[PDB]
């Protein structure tokens, strides 16, 4: 049998890729972004369906021989009620009809868009959730405030801003005392533009006689109050107790501006 020149190959030395186990990489795969390959090591053929069900947002790619595979994110399936009412959760796990922040074997990953709070993807959900008993002061104030500085800066994120402002203008004209509307009026003031000031006066002038009699007596003084204020050189807002006791969010723009014209002596001026 012409005794062949046999020789065995050198003993194998596995790399880090070859020692990867996908069942330990839930915290590595979840933060992965689009167009990024996350190598998971050699994957047996019978475990492919187990991996593809755990990560439906990802595409399983056979990258090399011996079953070497990687995961490539294709989409974000995060729903509005699970991604929009928080700013710290980037993903969650679904198992047996329940939603959890912690991974568990047999659960399905679902991830939120990184720009979900930089665009307008949450405006519809939070417009209803920030009304009534579901109002969360922290989340809802941060949502309204973050709109005025919409990080998208895209011609679409800028238009979703105008759509939201028209909705809040219609809602808050019916009643400006609800907490989400008082927050909207406050953030319009802080924006300090000609459009935001114009929208403030529009909303406050649309209010009922009940609202104006309750919150806007600094803007609508009585006959005797207005007549007596003509006897002083300073603006009425600088001494009127109705203006010193007023909610600044319900002041007309003129009254708000006049409040800062009161010639404060060095120290405390009143």
């Amino acid at each position, epitope marked *: 049998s012409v005794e062949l020149p046999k020789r065995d190959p050198p003993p194998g030395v596995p790399t880090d890729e070859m020692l990867l186990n996908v069942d330990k990489m839930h915290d590595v795969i979840a933060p992965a972004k689009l167009l990024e390959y996350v190598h998971i090591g050699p994957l047996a053929k019978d475990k492919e369906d187990k991996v593809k069900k755990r990560y439906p947002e990802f595409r399983l790619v056979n990258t090399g021989p011996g079953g070497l595979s990687a995961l490539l994110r294709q989409s974000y399936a995060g729903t509005a009620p699970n991604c929009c009412r928080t700013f710290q959760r980037t993903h969650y796990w679904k198992k047996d009809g329940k939603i959890s922040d912690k991974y568990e074997e047999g659960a399905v990953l679902e991830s939120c868009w990184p720009d979900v709070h930089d665009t307008g993807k949450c405006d519809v959900d939070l417009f209803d959730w920030c009304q009534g008993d579901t109002f969360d002061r922290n989340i809802c104030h941060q949502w309204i405030g973050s709109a005025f500085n919409r990080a998208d800066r895209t011609v679409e994120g800028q238009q979703s801003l105008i759509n939201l402002y028209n909705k809040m203008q219609t809602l808050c004209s019916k009643d400006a005392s609800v907490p989400i509307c008082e927050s909207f009026l406050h953030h319009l003031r802080a924006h300090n533009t000609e459009d935001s000031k114009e929208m403030i006066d529009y909303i406050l002038r649309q209010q009922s006689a009940d609202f104006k009699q309750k919150y806007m007596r600094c803007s609508y003084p009585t006959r005797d109050k207005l007549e007596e204020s*003509l006897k002083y*050189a300073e603006p009425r807002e600088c001494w009127d107790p109705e203006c010193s006791n007023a909610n600044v969010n319900f002041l007309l723009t003129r009254n708000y501006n006049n409040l800062g*014209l009161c010639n404060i002596v060095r120290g405390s001026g009143l």
Partner: nanobody
Amino acid sequence: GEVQLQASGGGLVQPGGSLRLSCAASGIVFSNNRMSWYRQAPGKQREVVATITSGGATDYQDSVEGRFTISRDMAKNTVYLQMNSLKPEDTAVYFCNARRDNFATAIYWGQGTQVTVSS
């Protein structure tokens, strides 16, 4: 004498129209006085409609807020009153009023101009 607060610009216009009243002051400097537009309905007491301080801060009567606007021209020493969306209850004689900053005795009232809106 010779403190002159003559009001003009009135007239007749259908409800919803607009008027612009004028009051070219003489003998009075605006940087010293508070200028206030009054009005007096037939058979009723006079009431202040708008006002502007010597610094330029304005204030209005509630039933005219948003519709009327009082402004100043320091060079021309003339105060103005833009009237928009005139309602039938705005029919009155509108006249000027100058009040000194810290001299209560130096108050002067001017001759009015007729404002009438109807159909």
